Amino acid sequence: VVHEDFQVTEEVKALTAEIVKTIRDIIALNPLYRESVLQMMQAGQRVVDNPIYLSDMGAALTGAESHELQDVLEETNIPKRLYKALSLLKKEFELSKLQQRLGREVEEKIKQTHRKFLLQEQLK
Amino acid sequence: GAESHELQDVLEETNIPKRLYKALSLLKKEFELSKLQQRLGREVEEKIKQTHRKFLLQEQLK
Amino acid sequence: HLPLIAITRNPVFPRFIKIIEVKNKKLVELL
């Protein structure tokens, strides 16, 4: 289990911060699991002594297939796997954003159809 | 987002000008850190978008 | 003259509303 890290453990957590913030955004846009795990597992409480496993949970919280997760697990370099997890997160971000945008497009268009019927009666 | 040690060191400074200057310097350092992280994430996101847009086209096709 | 409250990584910025939560019940009796 490779667990290499920089002795300058000051600016590295920012990435994890980003990731958790990113992960937060996930649950904000894509409800998958209870936000309670975020509540108890707070990165600012100094309770995450194995941040590699926090990154693993974040990757698991993504919808990445088994192939992408295997590729990530094959990344021993902590920064590289973290950036790959960021890439998967961004992929799912765009996927869900397009899904919600298209659903909203459909619903507004149906509402416009109903309003067009209303206004066709008003035209009559 | 200055760490607790930064806050304690700021509180250590007594004179209002000195503590205010330390707060300004901490603000500058936090701004630099945010800028650096945003630049790194921007480069990584650009490299992700370095993926041909046909990747997004196949996403749409699926 | 009260026992020190276990911070447990709960920074309280000045003039800032913050939340203190400690699993220990020994603080509940003191409260």
Swiss-Prot record, chain B:
ATP-dependent serine protease that mediates the selective degradation of misfolded, unassembled or oxidatively damaged polypeptides as well as certain short-lived regulatory proteins in the mitochondrial matrix. Endogenous substrates include mitochondrial steroidogenic acute regulatory (StAR) protein, DELE1, helicase Twinkle (TWNK) and the large ribosomal subunit protein MRPL32/bL32m. MRPL32/bL32m is protected from degradation by LONP1 when it is bound to a nucleic acid (RNA), but TWNK is not. May also have a chaperone function in the assembly of inner membrane protein complexes. It is found in: Mitochondrion matrix. The Lon N-terminal domains are crucial for the overall structure of the protein, maintaining it in a conformation allowing its proper functioning. The AP-domain (ATP-binding and proteolytic domains) has a closed-ring conformation in the presence of AMP-PNP and its N-terminal entry gate appears closed. Upon ADP binding, it switches to a lock-washer conformation and its N-terminal gate opens. The gene is LONP1. It is linked to CODAS syndrome: A rare syndrome characterized by the combination of cerebral, ocular, dental, auricular, and skeletal features. These include developmental delay, craniofacial anomalies, cataracts, ptosis, median nasal groove, delayed tooth eruption, hearing loss, short stature, delayed epiphyseal ossification, metaphyseal hip dysplasia, and vertebral coronal clefts. Homohexamer. Organized in a ring with a central cavity. The ATP-binding and proteolytic domains (AP-domain) form a hexameric chamber, while the N-terminal domain is arranged as a trimer of dimers. DNA and RNA binding is stimulated by substrate and inhibited by ATP binding. Interacts with TWNK and mitochondrial DNA polymerase subunit POLG. Belongs to the peptidase S16 family. Duodenum, heart, lung and liver, but not thymus. This is Lon protease homolog, mitochondrial.
